[PDB]
Structure formats: C-alpha cells, structure tokens
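Limitations
The structure tokens in this dataset are predictions for the assembled complex, not deposited experimental models. Users should treat interface geometry with appropriate caution, especially where small molecules or nucleic acid strands are included. An illustrative entry is reproduced here so readers can see what is and is not provided.
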Amino acid sequence: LPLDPLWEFPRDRLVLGKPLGEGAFGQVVRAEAFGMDPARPDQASTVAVKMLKDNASDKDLADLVSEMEVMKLIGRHKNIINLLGVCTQEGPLYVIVECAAKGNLREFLRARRPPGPDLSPDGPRSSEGPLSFPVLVSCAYQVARGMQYLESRKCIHRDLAARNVLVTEDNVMKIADFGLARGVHHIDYYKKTSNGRLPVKWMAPEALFDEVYTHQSDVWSFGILLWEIFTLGGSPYPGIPVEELFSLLREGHRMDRPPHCPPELYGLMRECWHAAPSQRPTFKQLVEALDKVLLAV
Ligand SMILES: Cc1ccc(C(=O)Nc2ccc(CN3CCN(C)CC3)c(C(F)(F)F)c2)cc1C#Cc1cnc2cccnn12
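Predicted assembly:
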C-alpha cells in the first residue's frame, strides 16, 4: 500500500483496547490515540479502529482498502462516522474513525424505554422515562441530514438501519457501517444475526426482488428506521418470518401504525414505503418535513 501523507497516522500512537464487534467485513476495536490533532501531539482521544480478522484473505484486504478509499472521498459531516486516519505502512491495515460513546441507536433506544406499570412510584418523576418525543424526532432528523449528505456524494448505503446508526456522548446521530462491499449478489435472505436481526426486513422491494439499489431504496429503509425509532428499538414486521414476508410484500402489506406515534410520523413512514420509488420522498424532503415537526415542538 502507498503512503498517503494526508491521512497517514503513526500506528505507535494507538493503544488498542476492547473489541466493539466482529463481522464479515473485519473487526472493530476501541482505542486510545495520542496526537490525533497534530497541534497537540501528546493529547489523548478515544477512537475506533477497523482492521482485518485473524485469518483474512486477499478479498478481505481489498474490501477494507475499498472501505478506506470510500471514506476518504466522502468528506466530513456531523451526522456520519468520520474518518480520522489510516495506518497503512509497516504493519496491519488500520482504518481509524470517530468513536460514538453510547453505541448503536437500536441498543440506545431499547435501554431507554419508559418505566412499566410494575413500577412503585418513587419521587416526582416516576412516570417520566429518558426519551421524549422531540428528542426522538431529532434523532430521525439527524439521520435524514446524514443521508442527504451521503446522497449528495453519490453514496448509496444499502443497509440503513438503527443498528448502523451510532450515538455520541452528546446524543448526535452518526451513520456508520459495519459493512461496505455488501455482496449484493449473494445475500442470504433467511440470515438471522446473533442478536436475532433479519436484515431482509429493511430492503426495498426493488432491491429484494429486482436487485436494484438507488437513493430511493435507502429512503424505504429510512422508513423502516423511523418505525424502529418510534417503537423505541422494536423489530420490524413483528412475528413475520422471512417466508411470509416475501408473500406479504408481493401483496403490498405494510406495517401498522405503532402505539403512541402521531399520524404525522406514521404518515411519513407510509410515504417512504410507496411501491414506486419515484413516489417516495427524497431525503431533502424528509429533512424539511422533520424540521417542520422539530420547530413545532
Ligand atoms: C472502525 C470503523 C471503520 C469504519 C466504519 C464505517 O462506518 N465505514 C463506512 C463504510 C461505508 C459507508 C458507505 N458505504 C456503504 C456501503 N455502500 C454500498 C457504499 C458506501 C459508510 C457511510 F457512513 F458513509 F455510510 C461508512 C465505522 C467504524 C466504527 C465505529 C464505532 C465508533 N464508535 C462505536 C461504538 C460501537 C461500535 N462501533 N463504533
């Protein structure tokens, strides 16, 4: 690999820490970095480091290099996980990115569900959970802003889901993945992850049936992500196995309106799931629509 002085970071300024997850596309580890800002060479910061698994092949390495190159090109935005540096010289390939201290959006919501009626009232805020409507709307708005930026850079995500949105210490939403060379020509549609996820449930129909991905396919997934947010991390198409999902999508089945969700937001969900990709909103329109809701509250 050639040395790119713009992005290269000395590997000896990293102290690797706890693994944050392994996947098909490598492994991600928490690390401490010293002097990420060259103006403060001894300053510590917490970053995340992507690297190859133990017995990885050439395709795996090419896949990670491909990811590195895409991230260089994408540039910086508040609502995406940003590239910080790379280690390409004299040792294993490292791709260094921002660390989002609160983990992924799905787990963030599920850990913050309101207290149930089993509660015994204790103090003046027994009924008040950590999550409020305007903050949920702000989460959706931020994801839409990041997706609008990604679309402007001609980037199609292809697995937009709450699992792939990360949450910073300041509750800022950051689109990640946790994928890139997604192998769209050999998806196991029946795949269930170790946490029980069925990723086929986020795919637009034209992607699933016709293997066509566009920015409007990501808009479909965003609708699913909106449903995730307003169910506080619920699993889509509850109780529906993959075999039945296929036939229900062919009949044009859509998820019901979830409890305690205003019609404005179920309205947006159903717009995102219009059969014709051209009749779904663009991310620009979703940003504007959610902004209006945010201002009203
Ligand atoms: C180490 C690391 C390396 C890489 C990436 C990464 O997200 N790369 C990325 C690859 C592709 C794309 C877009 N493509 C999609 C596919 N597609 C078909 C083409 C274009 C994007 C996108 F954001 F632009 F979408 C990002 C994230 C991390 C992390 C981390 C981290 C920080 N805090 C925590 C806390 C808990 C867990 N993890 N974690």
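Some entries come with short summary sentences. For this one: The pocket of 0LI is lined by residues 20-21, 28, 48-50, 67, 70-71, 74, 80-81, 95, 97-100, 103, 150, 155-158, 166, 175-180, 182 (CB under 6 Å).
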